[PDB]
Amino acid sequence: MELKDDDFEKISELGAGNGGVVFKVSHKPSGLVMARKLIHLEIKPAIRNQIIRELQVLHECNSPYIVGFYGAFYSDGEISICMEHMDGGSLDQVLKKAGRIPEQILGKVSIAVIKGLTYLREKHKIMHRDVKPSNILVNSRGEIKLCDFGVSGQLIDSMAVGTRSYMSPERLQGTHYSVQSDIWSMGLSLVEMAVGRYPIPPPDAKELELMFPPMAIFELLDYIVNEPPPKLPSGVFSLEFQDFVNKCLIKNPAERADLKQLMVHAFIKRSDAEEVDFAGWLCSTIGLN
Ligand SMILES: Nc1ncnc2c1ncn2[C@@H]1O[C@H](COP(=O)(O)OP(=O)(O)OP(=O)(O)O)[C@@H](O)[C@H]1O
Ligand SMILES: O=C(NOC[C@H](O)CO)c1oc2ccncc2c1Nc1ccc(I)cc1F
Ligand SMILES: [Mg+2]
């Protein structure tokens, strides 16, 4: 069935970010609860049809590790993307409530991200372009899924920041980037979620004892490109996890691990095996089920 603006009704607001908002909505004809992302684009009527045409590939993006698509359309100023509502929210929200995410749980997340990126690359020849805790969504059935990935080339162009960057040194320095950049972002997201705050600048010894002003824009970006990369602190995390993120966070993109290598890394092989009630933990920590 085709989706159209007058067929919806706002239930609540799921949040916002550097531009458009997302509503939890009810599609009246179907009865389905959905997440409707609205993106404001003062943009000519020709190229906004291309965007919709290009977003139709999302109907073929079916994976347990990728947020489901219902449809896309242009309303009155705004292009609407309608997706699966994920009742656990994004990992940036669960981090706020959780304080930290345990390593075992990050093992399950790492698995999901790797397998999602792999799906998008192998089956659709696309890079994410925007991996970070807020674009990894989770639900009470224990699923972990990626969203907000770069399907439509046009949409990427029509949007082209914030105060915290998950961009890789190479992408920060110019156009010379591609799929290896998603690895960096994943690695940084993981350190963030393990430690409970954005890992740049790194915490001093005294701030690490406590766990176990904000930087200016240029200061921070300079740190990412010119200063050694962030590390998981020693002692409180397994050596294999430490290696995992170190392999993700190698400044040189060719030297950096790729998805094939990460898939067979000791930390994944260990997390594959482990028995973890992610569904249970998630609800327990945010108060749902
Ligand atoms: N499908 C969904 N189900 C449930 N919540 C969602 C869904 N999509 C987005 N959200 C929520 O909406 C919020 C805003 O999302 P949006 O993608 O507009 O920005 P963001 O990714 O949070 O931050 P940024 O602006 O840096 O991308 C997210 O933080 C997330 O909590
Ligand atoms: O939402 C995106 N960025 O977040 C920016 C924030 O809202 C800030 O304003 C975004 O960027 C793209 C670029 C190209 N193609 C698609 C998208 C796309 N959305 C998208 C992709 C897959 C699925 I499942 C659902 C989606 F909502
Ligand atoms: Mg987002």
Report whether 103 belongs to an annotated binding site.
Answer: no
- Is the CB of 17 inside a 6 Å radius of any atom of ligand 2? yes
Q: What is the DSSP string of 87-115?
A: TT-BHHHHHHHHSS--HHHHHHHHHHHHH
Distance 34 CA to ligand 2 centre (A): 15
When computed from its CA atoms, the radius of gyration of the chain, rounded to whole angstroms, is: 19
Report whether 63 belongs to an annotated binding site.
Answer: no
Buried b (16+ CB within 10 A) or exposed e, 55-67: beebeebebebbb
Establish whether 272 is a catalytic residue.
Answer: no
State how far the Cα of 263 lies from the Cα of 268, in Å rounded to an integer: 6
State how far the Cα of 166 lies from the Cα of 121, in Å rounded to an integer: 20
Instruction: List the chain domain ranges.
Output: 1-86, 87-289
Q: Which of 5, 7, 130, 258 is catalytic?
A: 130
3-state helix, strand, coil in the chain (%, to 5): 45, 15, 40
Query: What was the resolution (in A) of this experimentally determined structure?
Result: 2.7
Beta bridge partners of residue 15, listed in sequence order: 22
Domain 1-86 falls in which CATH fold? Phosphorylase Kinase; domain 1 (3.30.200)
Q: 101, 99, 103, 98: which is closest to 239 by C-alpha?
A: 103
Q: How many CA atoms lie less than 13 Å away from 185 in the CB half-sphere?
A: 28
Report whether 107 belongs to an annotated binding site.
Answer: no
State how far the Cα of 244 lies from the Cα of 262, in Å rounded to an integer: 7
Beta bridge partners of residue 13, listed in sequence order: 23
What would the CATH number be for the domain defined by 87-289?
1.10.510.10
Do residues 106 and 194 lie in contact, with contact meaning Cβ atoms separated by under 8 Å?
yes
State how far the Cα of 167 lies from the Cα of 268, in Å rounded to an integer: 24
Method: X-ray
Ligand 1, atom nearest to 132 Cα: 21
CA angle 114, 200, 218 (to 5 degrees): 115
- Is the CB of 89 inside a 6 Å radius of any atom of ligand 1? yes
Distance 39 CA to ligand 1 centre (A): 12
The tokens for 79 are: 């292009």
- Is the CB of 41 inside a 6 Å radius of any atom of ligand 2? no
Do residues 123 and 152 lie in contact, with contact meaning Cβ atoms separated by under 8 Å?
no
